[PDB]
Amino acid sequence: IAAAIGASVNYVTGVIARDKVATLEQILWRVLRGNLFFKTVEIEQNAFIVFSHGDLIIKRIRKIAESLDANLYDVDSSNEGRSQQLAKVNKNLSDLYTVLKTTSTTLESELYAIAKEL
Amino acid sequence: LTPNQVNDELNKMQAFIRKEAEEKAKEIQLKADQEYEIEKTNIVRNETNNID
Amino acid sequence: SLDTLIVESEELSKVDNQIGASIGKIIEILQGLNETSTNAYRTLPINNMPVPEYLE
Amino acid sequence: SQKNGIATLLQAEKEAHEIVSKARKYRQDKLKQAKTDAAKEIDSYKIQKDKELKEF
Amino acid sequence: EQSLRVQLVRLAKTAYVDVFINWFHIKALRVYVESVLRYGLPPHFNIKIIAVPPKNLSKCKSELIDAFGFLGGNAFMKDKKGKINKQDTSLHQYASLVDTEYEPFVMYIINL
């Protein structure tokens, strides 16, 4: 906070399958980039990992993230566009939920209709 | 981690950031003086030949 | 700077290993020639000063 | 010290941003200075050549 | 064969010294830059070359780790000894370009 919609500070948000995979990342980082990170983790249902860095060492962090299968992006999501980022994300998540359900209904309807016919 | 580790790693961290800013800032201003001097000479030199 | 620093360490590691290997081959070229047999050129002078004395 | 440490990292970055920004403004100022100090050095050479043309 | 052998023995010996002075120049550089990366400030460091008598390296390496290890990590630290070179794994190679096992303080092992 005080850089939530910031751009002069670089944050790296990212999902990782487990906190175990995250250690291996931490090991690369510490060997190859120094201790320029602050490592925090929150348990999901996945693991929220957070690395926090300069805005000019991004690419080198990115190389580590790609090679151990992490979703650490500079900013997560292509939906960011309201201020906060999250506000846009939350409305786009309401379109996604209702549009999947309609698909499930058309499929279901047709399934009950044609099983016997087939 | 340990309290000792985290403060040692914070004191290292901002020391690099201030240092990166000093080191880049020196190059910019060191080149800005070469640029001043050159550009002042050029502007005269062009024009003094015209007055001539 | 900070960005350049990462790249300075990466190269020191590589270059270090090259030089270390390359010297290993030179020692071998001598060993084979019979110019290094019992002991020679790992304790021998380095511009008129033995190897351990030279490091100090 | 989780959001106390991230909070220091955020300030340090902000501090770096202004330091870099200041040297970029310094240079900007220096480009305007070249012009200024050059504009004066032209009209001093102008007035001498006007004088010795008028002597003739 | 005769002329060549005399120039060739001479050329290697002359090459040997030069590549020796050059190997240590990188290590000195390497160690210095690394120290800056890991500890931060001060940029003024207390630096030594310790001559170990043959086969006491493992015992020496461990003692240094216990004392000084806390500085570079209070959790990033484990006991370790000696130097093993491999292409089985990349771990244990003590390098900043490939992933290795992180040493608790800057220490480089020279084998002659």
Side-chain angles (χ1 to χ4, degrees), chain D residues 7-25:
Chain D
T8 295
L9 193 59
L10 294 171
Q11 187 69 61
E13 285 280 307
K14 295 263 201 301
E15 265 177 282
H17 176 78
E18 189 47 45
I19 290 162
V20 178
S21 282
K22 167 190 61 61
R24 291 303 202 184
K25 201 67 200 63

Side-chain angles (χ1 to χ4, degrees), chain B residues 48 51, chain D residues 41-51:
Chain B
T48 54
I51 301 171
Chain D
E41 186 180 346
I42 64 154
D43 289 278
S44 49
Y45 188 72
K46 187 71 169 44
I47 60 107
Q48 182 68 242
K49 290 313 210 193
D50 290 348
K51 197 57 204 181

Side-chain angles (χ1 to χ4, degrees), chain E residues 6 23 29 42-43 51 65 88 93 108:
Chain E
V6 174
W23 196 28
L29 188 67
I65 271 179
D88 291 289
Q93 204 62 251
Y108 288 95

Side-chain angles (χ1 to χ4, degrees), chain A residues 1-2 8-9 38 40 54-55, chain D residues 1-2 5 9-10 13-14 17:
Chain A
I1 193 53
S8 301
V9 203
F38 188 115
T40 50
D55 302 56
Chain D
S1 179
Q2 173 189 38
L9 193 59
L10 294 171
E13 285 280 307
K14 295 263 201 301
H17 176 78

Side-chain angles (χ1 to χ4, degrees), chain B residues 7 10 13-14 17-18 21-22 24-25 28-29 32-33 35-36 39-40 43-44 47-48 51-52, chain D residues 5 8-9 12-13 15-16 19-20 23-24 26-27 30-31 33-35 37-38 41-42 45 49:
Chain B
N7 297 351
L10 290 171
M13 258 207 290
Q14 57 186 25
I17 294 171
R18 211 74 56 250
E22 284 165 313
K24 283 166 191 294
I28 296 146
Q29 72 185 313
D33 282 80
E35 283 172 272
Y36 160 50
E39 195 182 297
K40 170 168 28 157
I43 292 166
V44 181
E47 193 55 71
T48 54
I51 301 171
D52 293 328
Chain D
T8 295
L9 193 59
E13 285 280 307
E15 265 177 282
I19 290 162
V20 178
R24 291 303 202 184
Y26 181 69
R27 175 167 160 267
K30 290 296 278 196
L31 293 181
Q33 203 176 341
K35 290 171 197 303
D37 308 340
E41 186 180 346
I42 64 154
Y45 188 72
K49 290 313 210 193

Side-chain angles (χ1 to χ4, degrees), chain A residues 27-47:
Chain A
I27 296 177
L28 273 81
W29 291 95
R30 72 173 79 145
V31 174
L32 310 174
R33 314 286 164 224
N35 290 14
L36 298 171
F37 52 85
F38 188 115
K39 181 172 191 63
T40 50
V41 274
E42 267 191 307
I43 305 175
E44 296 295 297
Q45 292 82 49
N46 299 317

